[PDB]
Amino acid sequence: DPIREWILTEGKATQITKIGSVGGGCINLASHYQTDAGSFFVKTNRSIGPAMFEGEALGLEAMYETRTIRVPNPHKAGELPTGGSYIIMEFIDFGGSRGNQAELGRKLAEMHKAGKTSKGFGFEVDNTIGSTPQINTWSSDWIEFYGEKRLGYQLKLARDQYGDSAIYQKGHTLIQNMAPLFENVVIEPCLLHGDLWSGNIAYDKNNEPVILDPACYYGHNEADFGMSWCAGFGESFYNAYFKVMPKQAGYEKRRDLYLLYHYLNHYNLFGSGYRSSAMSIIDDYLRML
Amino acid sequence: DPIREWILTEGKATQITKIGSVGGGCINLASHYQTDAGSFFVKTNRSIGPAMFEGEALGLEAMYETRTIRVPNPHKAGELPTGGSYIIMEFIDFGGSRGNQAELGRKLAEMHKAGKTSKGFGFEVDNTIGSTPQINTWSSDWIEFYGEKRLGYQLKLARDQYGDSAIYQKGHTLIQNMAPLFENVVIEPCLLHGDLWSGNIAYDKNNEPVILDPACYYGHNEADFGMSWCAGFGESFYNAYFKVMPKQAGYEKRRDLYLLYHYLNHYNLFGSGYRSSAMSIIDDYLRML
Numbered sequence: 001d002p003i004r005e006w007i008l009t010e011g012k013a014t015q016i017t018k019i020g021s022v023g024g025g026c027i028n029l030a031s032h033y034q035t036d037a038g039s040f041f042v043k044t045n046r047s048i049g050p051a052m053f054e055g056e057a058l059g060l061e062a063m064y065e066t067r068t069i070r071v072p073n074p075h076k077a078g079e080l081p082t083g084g085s086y087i088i089m090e091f092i093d094f095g096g097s098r099g100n101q102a103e104l105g106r107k108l109a110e111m112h113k114a115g116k117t118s119k120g121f122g123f124e125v126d127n128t129i130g131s132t133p134q135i136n137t138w139s140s141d142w143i144e145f146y147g148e149k150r151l152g153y154q155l156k157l158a159r160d161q162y163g164d165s166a167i168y169q170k171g172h173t174l175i176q177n178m179a180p181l182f183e184n185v186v187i188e189p190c191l192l193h194g195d196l197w198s199g200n201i202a203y204d205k206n207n208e209p210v211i212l213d214p215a216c217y218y219g220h221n222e223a224d225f226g227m228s229w230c231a232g233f234g235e236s237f238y239n240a241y242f243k244v245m246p247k248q249a250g251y252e253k254r255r256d257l258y259l260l261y262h263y264l265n266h267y268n269l270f271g272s273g274y275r276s277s278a279m280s281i282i283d284d285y286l287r288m289l
Numbered sequence: 290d291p292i293r294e295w296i297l298t299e300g301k302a303t304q305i306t307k308i309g310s311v312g313g314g315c316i317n318l319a320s321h322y323q324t325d326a327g328s329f330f331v332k333t334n335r336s337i338g339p340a341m342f343e344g345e346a347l348g349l350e351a352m353y354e355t356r357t358i359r360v361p362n363p364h365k366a367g368e369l370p371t372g373g374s375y376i377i378m379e380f381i382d383f384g385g386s387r388g389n390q391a392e393l394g395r396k397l398a399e400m401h402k403a404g405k406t407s408k409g410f411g412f413e414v415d416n417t418i419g420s421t422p423q424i425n426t427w428s429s430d431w432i433e434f435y436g437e438k439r440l441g442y443q444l445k446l447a448r449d450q451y452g453d454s455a456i457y458q459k460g461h462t463l464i465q466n467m468a469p470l471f472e473n474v475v476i477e478p479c480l481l482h483g484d485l486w487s488g489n490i491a492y493d494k495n496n497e498p499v500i501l502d503p504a505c506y507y508g509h510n511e512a513d514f515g516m517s518w519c520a521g522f523g524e525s526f527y528n529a530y531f532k533v534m535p536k537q538a539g540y541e542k543r544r545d546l547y548l549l550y551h552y553l554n555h556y557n558l559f560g561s562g563y564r565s566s567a568m569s570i571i572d573d574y575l576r577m578l
């Protein structure tokens with residue numbers, strides 16, 4: 001044990017009293033299947049059970065049916081007999097050299113607008129945002145849904161993983177004083193991609209946008225910008241977006257509220273380096289409110 | 290085997306001629322060791338040989354010795370007898386309450402200014418950017434080093450993995466016509482972090498910045514902004530940076546050229562969804578020139 005060896009000689013220690021470990025998961029295997037009937041795209045993971053790929057399949061299916069922005073047609077998700085899970089979907093040839101930021105904003109807004117539900121805010125099944133569970137139980141009030149099943153779940157999860165009771169308490173003050181940020185606007189459920197950043201966006205041979213790896217649910221359309229800090233969205237993206245889905249009162253005031261969910265998720269997934277970003281946002285809203 | 294089964298049940302195929310696979314690795318295990326002599330931070334990976342962690346340790350050490358921006362003090366890297374590799378470094382308690390942008394820009398500019406070398410552009414050893422090798426052979430001309438050992442290496446790799454001879458040819462056209470972007474300015478070698486985005490930045494108990502997981506070398510200071518599209522650099526970041534470091538002519542013109550290296554690396558690591566960002570930048574420069 002060279003780690004133990006170094007720590008007990010050179011590190012000047014005589015006993016190791018605790019070891020806490022995170023990480024270590026295995027990444028998906030991504031495969032191109034070549035057959036006499038064309039290509040298929042397959043992703044396998046021997047360590048993870050089938051729930052994650054099933055939620056992806058149902059997310060791709062719901063966005064595919066709006067018939068707006070191009071997504072891979074999903075074919076099958078399930079369990080590997082050897083252990084693990086898989087998904088099979090349409091193979092798409094990426095790499096459109098021009099790209100089209102305005103086309104992405106237009107097509108995304110068409111998906112928000114066309115994707116409708118009579119059941120309120122939520123989704124048919126729970127799925128995941130990264131590896132974190134995403135709770136999707138149907139609710140009729142957006143402020144109720146987002147405060148409890150989005151911010152509230154992530155805060156409670158950080159209190160349990162890190163004993164971070166400070167962010168848990170300040171966060172729940174925010175959740176309780178949140179309503180003025182919504183300025184009495186009426187909020188219609190929209191089919192959201194749910195995890196929209198650079199790694200999930202591509203362009204096909206006609207230079208049309210394609211989006212991948214969803215964490216779908218029906219929510220406030222503005223929540224789909226909550227990963228924008230890793231997206232490179234320009235003014236041509238937003239102006240093409242707002243042409244189809246016009247900008248609502250309080251849009252600028254709420255941008256941080258929707259980033260906050262993903263900053264909490266990154267904290268809970270990737271460590272306390274992200275805690276300052278989340279805490280900074282919570283402090284400003286408490287001041288502003 | 291449901292994948293082969295489905296491809297011949299509902300996929301309507303009769304022979305699978307090839308299966309091309311990427312991904313599938315396992316991520317690092319990250320460990321907090323508590324001892325009677327204080328804490329240590331340890332990363333292990335049972336799959337990988339020690340070259341990546343050894344490059345990380347020497348990068349930390351170089352940044353540590355400038356005595357400017359805070360980085361974990363590295364202790365030891367090496368190979369696990371069971372197979373794989375490890376690194377041991379200083380444990381730091383993350384979780385700054387507000388977080389501090391201007392201080393990040395100040396401290397980073399000070400590191401560029403203090404970190405010097407008599408050997409030219411490059412580094413003591415080759416290391417890696419992500420998992421991709423980063424060639425650090427000492428050179429005395431920056432235009433030459435960046436064109437060959439950064440852009441050119443990435444273009445060759447892209448040609449070999451994807452048969453993308455178009456990006457390779459347009460790429461080498463740009464490299465050969467590159468000099469006007471530099472407007473004859475003299476370029477001093479600066480110690481660069483080399484992979485500076487949100488996941489590699491953190492804040493300690495005094496809300497001072499800490500940077501992690503380097504891909505270091507001595508280069509043009511402006512190349513350290515090549516990951517800014519996933520960094521969330523505020524205006525207070527750049528205002529504090531340019532207080533320490535004088536901005537050189539052509540700075541705005543060259544920003545995409547340094548993003549391009551990372552777009553190519555992301556293309557090579559995570560797939561052709563990133564090819565459009567790289568090609569768009571190469572196309573604009575060929576026009577502009």
Ligand SMILES: Nc1ncnc2c1ncn2[C@@H]1O[C@H](COP(=O)(O)OP(=O)(O)O)[C@@H](O)[C@H]1O
Binds near residue numbers: 332
């Ligand atoms: N020097 C350090 N001290 C304490 N914690 C650290 C240190 N470096 C990283 N961490 C923590 O370890 C975890 C993963 O580390 P990271 O730098 O992402 O390694 P990798 O790039 O191999 O995943 C995160 O929770 C992060 O906050």
Ligand SMILES: Nc1ncnc2c1ncn2[C@@H]1O[C@H](COP(=O)(O)OP(=O)(O)O)[C@@H](O)[C@H]1O
Binds near residue numbers: 030213312
């Ligand atoms: N439907 C698809 N058709 C063709 N290639 C795809 C498709 N979806 C993803 N890819 C490619 O597969 C690789 C991994 O895909 P990604 O969506 O990142 O999966 P994951 O995030 O589960 O690893 C990338 O190279 C990407 O270009």
Ligand SMILES: [Cl-]
Binds near residue numbers: 230
């Ligand atoms: Cl990310």
Ligand SMILES: [Cl-]
Binds near residue numbers: 486519
């Ligand atoms: Cl990234």
